[PDB]
Structure formats: C-alpha cells, structure tokens
C-alpha cells in the first residue's frame, strides 16, 4: 500500500519502510494419518492384471514407508535444530498405544484432538482410507466374480485413490523421510485451511495464514513418522506467526570508496548492517540475509531463528552513522570495484574506475550517465541500470523515494591511517585503531623532540 | 573441441582456456496462457462419478490459483532484483482490459504478439485450452445422456487434458507462484522451441538456445500472474545471451605455503581471484563462483549478474603476479592444510606437513607420490589423486595441459614481516604492510644508533 | 543408543561422542537401460486416438533424450568434480560397439556385468522394455484390428509402461541431463537394493547401504548418457562407503565474551573448529559444514570431499585448549551479541547485553533464566530456549550430559593488548599477536628509561 524508501548519499545505503510483519516464532505439531489395508496374498482377465499390478504398486509403497520408519552478518547467527519440535512429538507416537488412540479418535471423524501420553494434546487429522476401500470395495468385488473386474472404473478409482500414497512415498523416498515446502500430496489447500481453522491461534493469524497458505507451506515440514497397525502417519510441522503486523524495514548497503585518479590510492567503508528489520517486543529483529525473508506485496515473512535481536538503537544508523548510542557496523577495504544494489523502489550504484554506469528507459534509453562515487536513482523513470558489462532491472512497485544528499563519510578519513582490511568492525572499532595509529606517531615525534638536545 | 590448461607452480594456480561464452546478459517475458472454463454447479454412474471427481479436481485448482494471485570473491559482487522484469510485465495484465486483449488476439492462433497498453510489444501463447473440452465437448455429452457417460475413454481423455492445468497448480502451489527451472509442465519442448524461434534474436541465439534448452529451461523462470475471465496467465522469463562465442577461461587456485619442518613456521598465500572469466565488450566478465556458471562441453553459461566488469589486464596475473598494470588478488594465512583442486585437465595438490597425497591409476595403483608444496598432474595416465582420507576423480575430458616451472612466490617473503591474516588482501596491499613494518624496524634502529652518545 | 555431551564452560563449546561412521569415500558407477521401439510413422476411434497420442508423448520423450544428449572453516576444503567417475564412464559409452555390447548381455537377463573396451567391468540394469511392447503388444494389436482398441485396458496398460520413460525425461529436462537425489523413476527401491546386493562391496556395507536407501539416493547421482540403437542408458553414481562403524563426535562452538557493563569494553572469542569429526584410518576426517553430514539415529553419514585430514591429536582442543601437540583454532573480535546453539542433547546460550535468555518447560514454562555469558542447560526438563525474540526448540534425543566447570578463557585476556579481528586465527597465532604488541611496549618504556639522562 505505503511503501517509501530513503537513500544516504553519506553512508551509500537506502532504507525502505511501509512493511507490515509476520514473523514465525514457532511451531504448531500436527499428525497426519491415512488408513492401511494390511493385504498380503491375493487370490487371483486384463481387467484384474490391472487391478494385482495396482495391488503391488501399493504394497511396495508400504514397505517402502516400513524400511523409511526405521532405517553481511548472517555468521553472527545462532544454530538451530529446525524439526526438534516435529521430532519429539514423533518419538512419542512411538510409545505403546499412541496409534491405536489416534485410530479410536479418527473412528468415525476426519480430525481430532488426541492427548498424547506426556500432556500434549495435537490435532490429527485422517486425510484418505484405503483400508476401506481396498478390503470393503475392491477385493469384495474380485471374489463375487471370481477373478473378474467387468468395469474397469474400478481399475481407474483404485488408481485415483492409491496415487496420493504413491506420491508421498516417492516425496519421503527422495527427502529421507523429511520435505519442505509442504506438498499438496502431504497435505491439500483444504486440508491446510481446515488445520489452520482449527489451530490454537487468534483470527488475525488464522486470517494470515489462510491468505498466505503458499508462504505456510514453504515455512512448513513434513516428517515420516510411523507406520503400524494399518496407520500411516506423518507430523506436519506448521509455523506460528506470533509477531504480524509490526512495521518492518530493509537496509539496503553499497560499497562507498574515494574517487581519487591515482591507482591504488582509494579507500572503502561499506555498512555490513543490511537486511531485514521488524519491531518485535520492544527490541528489533535483525536477518541479515534478508533473501531468507519473503515479501508478498507489503507483508513480510521472515523467521526468527535467522534473526539477531537488537535494541531498536540500530534505527539511530540510519538518521546519523555517527550517533553515541549506537556502535553501526561497518566493513572497510582497498577494493573500489563497481556494483549496483537494486533496491524496493530503486538502485544504488557503486561506480569506481574506468567503469560504464548509466541508468535507462524503454522509451528513451539511456536517461543518466553516472559519475565516479555512491549515486542512486529511483524506479520512477528508471526501468534498469548497467554497471559495465552487468545489465540489471529494477523493480517496478509503486512507492515514493527521497534523495538525503550528503558527503561521503570517507572523504574524512585519514588514508594514511586508515584500517582498510577490517570485515566484523564498527564506527568505534575504526576509530579506535585510528587513534592508536595517531598515538604511535605522536610519541614517536614527541622523542624526535626530546632527542634534539 | 579444443581445451588447453596451464598450471603455475609458482602461484599455486591453473588456467584452462579453450571455451566459448553464453552469458545471460538480459531478459525476455513472455505470456503463457491456458483457456478456463467458467464452470460452478453441475447438473449430475460409475464413469460420471469419474467425470465429477475430475472437475472437482479442475475447480480446486482454479480456486487454488485465484487465492495464489492476490495472496573466494562473491562478497563483491552487487545485488540484482532477478524477477523484476516479469513481474513488472504481470503487473500491467492486471490493468483493465489487458487480458480481454490477449484473449481477443489469442482466439484463432496458439501465439500472437500483443501490444500492453504501456507500449511493451509480447509474445503470448495458449497452451492449452479446457474451455472447449469442458464447455463444448464435456458438458453437452452428460445432457444428451441424463447423466451417463457410456464411453470410459470420456474419463481418460478429461484426465489427460486436466493433468497439466494440476500439474502446474502444484508447481504453484509449492514455489509462491515463482519457479525455475521452467519445467516441462510450464513450457513443453516443443513450445519453449516455438518461443525461441519467435524471440527477437539473431539466428546464432535462435540456435544456441534451441540446442542448449535444457540450460535456457534453468536460467528461466515462470510467474504466476493472474486468473480471470477465462483466462489462466503465466510469465515465462526466458535469458537472452547477448554475447556469446567470446573466448572464456577458467582460473583454479590453491593454497601455496612455505614447508619448513618446524610447526607453526610456515606462511601462506592464495590467489583468491579463482573463476570463470569472459571477454565481453573490451572488459572481462569475472565470474568468483564457477559453480554458478554451467559447461556443456566447450560452452560456458554464465549469467552477468554472478560477474564484476574487470578491465581485460586481470589475466596478467596468469602471466606475471608481479606485473604492474593489474593489482593480483590474494589471501594470506598461516594455516598449511592440505587440499586439492580438480581442475578442467588436472589436479592441483597442495600437500603439508604429515599428509599422505598421491594420484592413481585404475590399471597401475599410485603412480605418484606427492612431496610436500603445490604440485599438479595432468589427467593423462591419471584418474584419481588422494589427499589424506580425500580421494577425488579427475576430470577425463580430452585435452593438452602444460607444466610452467618456478619457484613458488611465497619463498620470496620474510616470515618475520609478513602480514599472515589478509584476506580481500592484493599483491600491493601485502607489499605495503611489508613496508610499514620495514620502516618500523629502521626508524627504531636509528634511534638506536642516535642514542649511542 | 548411547549418545553423550560435555560442555565446557571454559570455551563455550559443547562435544557429542557415541555416534559411528559411514563416511562416502568412493563411487561405483552402474549403466541403467530402457529398451526402444524405434517406431516413425503410425497406420492409424475413441480408443486409438487415446494410443496415439501415447505414441506422440513416446515419441516427443525419446525425441527430448537424443536432443539433452548432445546438446566456520569450510573455506579450508579442496574442490572436487562431484560426477567427474560417472561422466568418465559415460563418454566409454559413446564408443563404437559399447552399446550393443550391453545390448547383448541384457538380452535375456534384466542385470549383467559388462567390461567396456577400457578394462573397467561395471553392472549394467535394464529396467523397462518399451520396445517389446510397443512392437510386439501394441502394434500387431492395430493392425489385426485394422485401427480399432476394443480393449480400453490396452491404453491404460501403455499408459503405465510409458509414464516411467516420461518421469525421467521430465527429470533429465529440468535438470540438465543430471539428477540428485536419485529418484525412484531412476532407479525403484528394489533395482536400488539389487544393485546394492550385487556392488563388489563387504556385507556389512550391503547392510548399511541397505538399510539407508534413502541416504544412499541422496549421495546419488543419476547421469543421463547416451540414446541410440533401442537403447536409453543413464549412469547411476553410487556411493561407497568405505569408512564404517569407526567412532564420531559433534563440536558446537559458540561465542565467548567477557561481561563487563562498559558498553564498547567486551572482548570475544568463538572456538572456529565446529563440525563432525570421524576417526579414519588413523586421522581424523573433519567435516567443518555439520549441515552437510546426515544423521540417522547414531549413525552419522559424511562425505570425504567435505573434510579436511586432521592428526587425531585435534580432540585434545576440547581437553585443554592451550595444550602444546595442537594448535586450537579460534576466532577473535568485539561483537558480544546473544545466540544460541541447540547441541544433540541440549542448548549452549550465549548471554550478553541487556538480552533476556532463559530455558523453558512444557509443564511449567520458564525453568531458568541466563546470566550474562556463555552457559549451558541439557535436554533433561528443558523443552525450549529463548535468546532475545528467538525460541529454540532443543533435540529430545535420550542421552546424558556433563556440565564441565571451568572460567572463561577470554578472562586470561588483556584486552588492552587483545587482537580482536582476527579471523582464521589460532591459540599460538593470538599469542604470538600479544607478545608482539607487549614486545612493542618493551621497547618503547625501554628507550624512556635510557632517555632519562
Ligand atoms: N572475517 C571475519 O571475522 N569473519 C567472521 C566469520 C565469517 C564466517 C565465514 O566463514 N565467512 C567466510 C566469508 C566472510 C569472511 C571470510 N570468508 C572467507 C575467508 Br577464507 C576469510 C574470511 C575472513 C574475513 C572476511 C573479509 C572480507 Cl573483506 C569478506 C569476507 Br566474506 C570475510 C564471512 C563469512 C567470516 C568473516
Ligand atoms: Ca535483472
Ligand atoms: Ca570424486
Ligand atoms: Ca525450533
């Protein structure tokens, strides 16, 4: 709706705000079932080839399953253990009786909530029955014809039944028992609305998750779990919103060299803070490899587990790099080579060198012939950049973009004294090498002084 | 047809040439449309059963699209925006009577050329049409029946036109509307081959891309955009390889450490530009991560947003790494582990300390010993090499590779001086840290001298 | 079964021992066929229009194959040429005679052994035959018929005899001609576990290989290869597990800072040598990506082109970091943020700032809350941690844990004289840095004393 951005000539970074949150905090554990016919001899006409072919197709999926069941700033990072959650509410489907409680529960109901031996009551959830239909429907009918099949319906409606099987098998076979994003065979769109209508959760995030269904299944997992008394079942490991609708910014960082003509004589500082930065509790939730993140029009998606929390001083960055309450993290170096950062609503462009950068339209070409430095342009306009041989289109959405003009901060550094190979630095960790590198040459000239006498 | 390889035992480095270009310089977008019939409620049999499941099938995957569609030097390289450009063509098919215009150009031919209202000219294709088959041939059947199908090839034939439209929904469904690689299901061969031979290009891309298509399928991507008014709409961004059969080589380094017996006396340095290289437009396009780019026997694939524009002097650092037009990009360390390097025609080896290296033979067993430092061996007679518990196979593309002798560069460093802990560090960046710390040294010592009286 | 944890309080990291290897080291490479028809042009109802557009879906399949046939320290690791064995064996293929070679010995039997013209004998396995059936099943069928099916079962029985072609055309397309995993339209569970019962391996490999279908697909590769003479070959790349059953152990590193309440006053360490490690053939193989390795249970499956050979004196770095056979591997700096690393049996939670940092309970909610620095709770009564706005789930793996007491290394620091940026750094490198920089200071208060007079 209200997307805008700013750029700092200063600091060679842009900032774009006017998106809303939704952040996954944790984990919602359902069970997924499906009910097993526990064939193993047949006694048994092309019709009934089809339907035994059909018959192995499925008892080698079950034993399939049966063989699966047993046997900048992105290193500052926490780790985690994604499907610990998913894991441990499996292990308990393990202990004697869970399966038959599950069975009993989704008797005669598709879905229902079933405590578990250690507390946790998880929703179930039986998404197809083949017990059903391969012992009540389709091996009724071959012993009343006696090794006949006559409609070959029947061939074409056991197949539609025992392909959903097939494929979560086939998915499992391939995924060690583990898949993300979340299947429309390990669950349907109906079956994920039906789950997410029934989860613990308030309206605003039942709401969330229903129109962003597609950004669920990506932030989900699908664990193979167990497979006994004629149950298959699976733990689908849903995410839980618990922060949405705080607003939420992205830094976007370019490297800002000098523009001097002699080579070899330039120095760089790029901000190592970019990303993705939501108001979360009274603190900031910082990814710093804001692709992990998904943006669906002004909403972002992102996961705290790729996230660092930050006092919301880290804001101060943005208004004055300089500020006291806030140490901004920075790189410095040597490498004055040319890039450009597309940002939300334009494009920074890091132009050093003999390098070409010019900005275009479809209608008129070449509309701006960038000059030596840190410049930006925004998308009003502007359709894609080029950066020597590196064409790059920009993004087309709706927004207002604002130019803040300033010097570069590099032009006040000491090139003499300047730590130009620090990656994980800061403004005060630059500044401090400075001054002992300004105090080693003050008491060397202070004895130069001494000594004259 | 014709590759070649150089290893320097001097630099602990390899360069293979002999490769021509294929580089994804820009973006095509293209429409892809699918016919949709506008079906609600029906009017209904064991086959018309079969016919309902499958429209039910057909309904759920129109209902899924709707909610779909509203809701070493890599660090250097800039930030693009990848699907900017289908996007930004999706979203003007979202302005009033867009669709209706390629519904109306679309009506009596499979592919036409539309003109948006914003002045963009696109190539659009109907790949499959369900409106007829539902509306003109599905529907009329079960009314002249009273709800009897009769013939089963009715239920098979529906399946078979059904399939893709599922097919693609689940795609969708599991990827947030973006895919790629474009799979089959988006564009089949033969319309990807269609499309192609369409495409505003020369006859050389019309060809390279006709023969490299499985490659085009992988730098591709397929947009979901809109569903309405019969209408399914897709964006197919294909590459656009604006240079192509320029020569390219590819550069493999490897650390290159002093092997003195005592433990923890031994420096270290890498040539850290590692990467495929293009000459393109008078510079050359650097690509730091090779795996990026993909080779299909002489030809490289390597998209330019992966690469930084570099002035064509960068090779001088194959000739001399001394040289003083172009500034040699290394690492230091003093970590001497041991590793190797497979290149296009060899194995570069860097053995230290008590590491076990050799290469093999499948006929002979080991057939070399590896003394410590960094050697290399040819794929000639060669088809293992084994660097402590690592055993790599060696590349067995046919070529001619050339041993250049000298003594490695970091025999020409004092230990005592040398800056151990550079990592976007250079030829001369080294060299100027060595000077500090030599003139550190005299001014101390003529202090010394000076103090003496 | 019997997985234990120590946590050493003194380096803020955590080691998990009990696990047993299965490490990749090798590969054996299989030719998979599928035989056919060679048909051109068709003589040709509801039922046969269905064949024949089967035909064209054949046809366009085999058409898609001959065009995709022509056409902290793992920065320390070498680079391998992961299918460089599987292309080798591949190009032998093209050879004039090598495919009816195969074609002969799998004439009657669907698996043998076949030696290539180069000496080397590898198992060859026909998995589907198209080729007596479209000529022998389906063709004499139209033909007696004079264009009629009668039999619907004869276009869904062609219907399945095809699909498979068409799933691996499907795979090779989106893929460039090379797959991984290696799926089950590659190769089924049952061609896998004959092809693992006749590999010339041990019996406790074919156990282990057999036991993990699902791994050994997923260190798969599947390489499409040559389509010529009624013949489609495809070469599978299977591991060889050459390293079993030796003992493994897990490194969790997390950050070690002082706590001091001057903000800009605190200096870090973080151990960098996390990662599995696995005794072989009297080294030790370091896996420094953990996420690489897959674990089943205690069973811990790693790839040798992932590790790095070590002297198995590297365990004695979680003995006593500052021992003199091994130099400990550490990184230093001045960022003290809050992170946790969830471990096999517990959760290591580095604590600084004003960030809140607690271990929580399913039963009773917050158990304990964190004091500044690095501490350490197991999964015994802890369910979850939280670190600033991040929440942890922790692994419920049964096992028992040791809390390891000790003051923090970082204490022993001057931080006056701490280099805090180094990055590929070392107990011995860090040391050698401060004796420099006290050395520097000798010097100087040296020439002070000698200046007064
Ligand atoms: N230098 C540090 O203190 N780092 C914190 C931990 C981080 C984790 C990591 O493995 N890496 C590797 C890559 C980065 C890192 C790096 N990478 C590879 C190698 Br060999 C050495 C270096 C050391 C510092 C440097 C300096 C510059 Cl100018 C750019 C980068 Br991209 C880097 C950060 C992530 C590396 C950077
Ligand atoms: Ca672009
Ligand atoms: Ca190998
Ligand atoms: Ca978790």
Same mark, same amino acid.
């Given at each position: 709706?209200?997307?805008?951005?700013?750029?700092?000539?200063? +600091?060679?970074?842009?900032?774009?705000?006017?998106?809303?949150?939704?952040?996954?905090?944790?984990?919602?554990?359902?069970?997924?079932?499906?009910? =097993?016919?526990? &064939?193993?001899?047949?006694?048994?006409?092309?019709?009934?080839?089809?339907?035994?072919?059909?018959?192995?197709?499925?008892?080698?999926?079950?034993?399939?399953?049966?063989?699966?069941?047993?046997?900048?700033?992105? $290193?500052?990072?926490?780790?985690?253990?994604?499907?610990?959650?998913?894991?441990?509410?499996?292990?308990?489907?393990?202990?004697?009786?869970?399966?038959?409680?599950?069975?009993?529960?989704?008797?005669?109901?598709?879905?229902?909530?079933?405590?578990?031996?250690?507390?946790?009551?998880?929703?179930?959830?039986?998404?197809?029955?083949?017990?059903?239909?391969?012992?009540?429907?389709?091996?009724?009918?071959?012993?009343?014809?006696?090794?006949? &099949?006559?409609?070959?319906?029947?061939?074409?409606?056991?197949?539609?039944?025992?392909?959903?099987?097939?494929?979560?098998?086939?998915?499992?076979?391939?995924?060690? %028992?583990? +898949?993300?994003?979340?299947?429309?065979?390990?669950?349907?769109?109906?079956? =994920?609305?039906?789950?997410? #209508?029934?989860?613990?959760?308030?309206?605003?995030?039942?709401?969330?998750?229903?129109?962003?269904?597609?950004?669920?299944?990506?932030?989900?997992?699908? &664990?193979?779990?167990?497979?006994?008394?004629?149950?298959?079942?699976?733990?689908?490991?849903?995410?839980?919103?618990?922060?949405?609708?705080?607003?939420?910014?992205?830094?976007?960082?370019?490297?800002?060299?000098?523009?001097?003509?002699?080579?070899?004589?330039?120095?760089?500082?790029?901000?190592?803070?970019?990303?993705?930065?939501?108001?979360?509790?009274?603190?900031?939730?910082?990814?710093?490899?804001?692709?992990?993140?998904?943006?669906?029009? #002004?909403?972002? $998606?992102?996961?705290?587990?790729?996230? =660092?929390?930050?006092?919301?001083?880290?804001?101060?960055?943005?208004?004055?790099? !300089?500020?006291?309450?806030?140490?901004?993290?920075?790189?410095?170096?040597?490498?004055?080579?040319?890039?450009?950062?597309?940002?939300?609503?334009?494009?920074?462009?890091?132009?050093?060198?003999?390098?070409?950068?010019?900005?275009?339209?479809?209608?008129?070409?070449?509309?701006?012939? !960038?000059?030596?430095?840190?410049?930006?342009?925004?998308?009003?306009?502007?359709?894609?950049?080029?950066?020597?041989?590196?064409?790059?289109?920009?993004?087309?959405?709706? %927004?207002?973009?604002?130019?803040?003009?300033?010097?570069?901060?590099?032009?006040?550094?000491?090139?003499?004294? $300047?730590?130009?190979?620090? $990656?994980?630095?800061?403004?005060?960790?630059?500044?401090?090498?400075?001054?002992?590198?300004?105090? !080693?040459?003050?008491?060397?000239?202070?004895?130069?002084?001494?000594?004259?006498?």
């Amino acid at each position: 709706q209200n997307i805008t951005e700013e750029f700092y000539q200063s +600091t060679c970074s842009a900032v774009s705000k006017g998106y809303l949150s939704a952040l996954r905090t944790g984990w919602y554990t359902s069970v997924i079932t499906i009910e =097993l016919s526990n &064939i193993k001899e047949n006694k048994c006409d092309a019709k009934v080839k089809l339907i035994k072919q059909e018959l192995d197709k499925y008892k080698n999926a079950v034993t399939e399953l049966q063989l699966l069941m047993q046997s900048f700033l992105g $290193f500052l990072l926490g780790v985690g253990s994604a499907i610990a959650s998913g894991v441990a509410v499996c292990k308990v489907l393990h202990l004697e009786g869970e399966v038959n409680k599950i069975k009993s529960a989704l008797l005669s109901t598709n879905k229902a909530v079933v405590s578990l031996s250690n507390g946790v009551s998880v929703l179930t959830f039986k998404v197809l029955d083949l017990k059903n239909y391969i012992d009540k429907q389709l091996l009724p009918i071959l012993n009343k014809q006696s090794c006949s &099949i006559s409609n070959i319906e029947t061939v074409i409606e056991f197949q539609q039944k025992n392909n959903r099987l097939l494929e979560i098998t086939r998915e499992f076979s391939v995924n060690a %028992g583990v +898949t993300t994003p979340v299947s429309t065979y390990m669950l349907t769109n109906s079956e =994920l609305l039906s789950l997410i #209508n029934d989860m613990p959760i308030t309206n605003d995030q039942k709401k969330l998750m229903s129109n962003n269904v597609q950004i669920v299944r990506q932030q989900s997992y699908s &664990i193979m779990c167990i497979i006994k008394e004629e149950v298959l079942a699976y733990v689908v490991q849903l995410p839980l919103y618990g922060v949405i609708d705080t607003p939420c910014w992205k830094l976007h960082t370019s490297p800002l060299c000098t523009t001097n003509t002699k080579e070899g004589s330039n120095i760089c500082l790029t901000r190592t803070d970019r990303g993705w930065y939501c108001d979360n509790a009274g603190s900031v939730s910082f990814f710093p490899q804001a692709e992990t993140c998904k943006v669906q029009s #002004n909403r972002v $998606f992102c996961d705290t587990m790729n996230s =660092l929390t930050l006092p919301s001083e880290v804001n101060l960055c943005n208004v004055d790099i !300089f500020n006291p309450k806030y140490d901004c993290k920075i790189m410095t170096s040597k490498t004055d080579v040319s890039s450009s950062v597309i940002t939300s609503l334009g494009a920074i462009v890091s132009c050093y060198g003999k390098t070409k950068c010019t900005a275009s339209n479809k209608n008129r070409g070449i509309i701006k012939t !960038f000059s030596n430095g840190c410049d930006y342009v925004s998308n009003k306009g502007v359709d894609t950049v080029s950066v020597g041989n590196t064409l790059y289109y920009v993004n087309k959405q709706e %927004g207002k973009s604002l130019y803040v003009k300033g010097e570069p901060i590099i032009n006040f550094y000491d090139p003499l004294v $300047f730590p130009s190979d620090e $990656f994980d630095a800061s403004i005060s960790q630059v500044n401090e090498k400075i001054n002992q590198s300004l105090a !080693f040459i003050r008491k060397s000239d202070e004895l130069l002084s001494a000594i004259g006498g």
